[PDB]
Amino acid sequence: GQELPPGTYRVDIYLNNGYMATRDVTFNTGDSEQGIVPCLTRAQLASMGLNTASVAGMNLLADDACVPLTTMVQDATAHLDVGQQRLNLTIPQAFMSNRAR
């Protein structure tokens, strides 16, 4: 349920079990494992190759929005592993441009 109150955490984004970036990632309160989710933006998402054009309503919002990645996209997730500082991430191939580098 809620098992981690909000803030920012220094971790490694791991999309589809592939390291993307190392940074702090602010979270806001939410619904999933921890009860919180990261403040991933248009730029940050599209950097992993997240296809904003696959989701009519993503491709118009701010490059520093708290995008509802896991509420406007299905099957994706953003599990903050605090224990390993590994922001375990997924995106379905549908919402991928062609390359997640």
From Swiss-Prot:
Compartments where found: Cell outer membrane
Coiled-coil segments on the chain, per record: none
Function: Involved in the export and assembly of FimA fimbrial subunits across the outer membrane.
Family: Belongs to the fimbrial export usher family.
Entry protein name: Outer membrane usher protein FimD
Encoding gene per record: fimD
Positions spanned in the full protein: 70 to 170 of 878
